[PDB]
Amino acid sequence: SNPVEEEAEKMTRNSWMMLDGTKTDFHITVRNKSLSCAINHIKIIPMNNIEQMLKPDYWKKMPPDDLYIMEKQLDWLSKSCVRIIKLITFDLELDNTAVPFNFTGFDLLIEYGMSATDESCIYLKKLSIPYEVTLRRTIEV
């Protein structure tokens, strides 16, 4: 047998406009039992996944049936932006959920943060945070 040492390592409804969020959560026992933060993350805006999905899917405009986007976009029916913090509660974590460029049949952003201050450990205990939101559409042409 060969072991080594055990290491010491809200459903918002935004109506097609800008918004905000705030996250200060004490699910951060991943280095020395939730002492403090490694380094900050001052209000990271999440709208870039659905920007670079909702732009080129309707800028496909090649033959759309052969699916050069060949993998299924069932995991792109949410957003799941990420904030992997560097080497108590969550110090700074805000996100401007801007629905002003968004689809009409999506639900959430399962936002996963790699909580560890673990220098190249390949170990980082990533805890995910959901939203389970709903969109009330205001206008169509």
Side-chain angles (χ1 to χ4, degrees), residues 38 46-64 98-100 104-106 111 113 116 123 130 138-140:
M47 311 335 287
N48 217 339
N49 169 233
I50 201 66
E51 292 321 289
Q52 283 326 290
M53 185 63 72
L54 183 63
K55 196 86 200 65
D57 188 40
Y58 274 96
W59 199 346
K60 210 199 301 178
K61 286 304 285 182
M62 289 190 135
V99 213
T104 176
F106 76 103
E111 190 276 331
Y123 199 78
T138 186
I139 205 164
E140 304 93 299

Side-chain angles (χ1 to χ4, degrees), residues 4-9 21:
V4 297
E5 59 86 19
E6 190 276 331
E7 314 280 337
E9 287 206 6

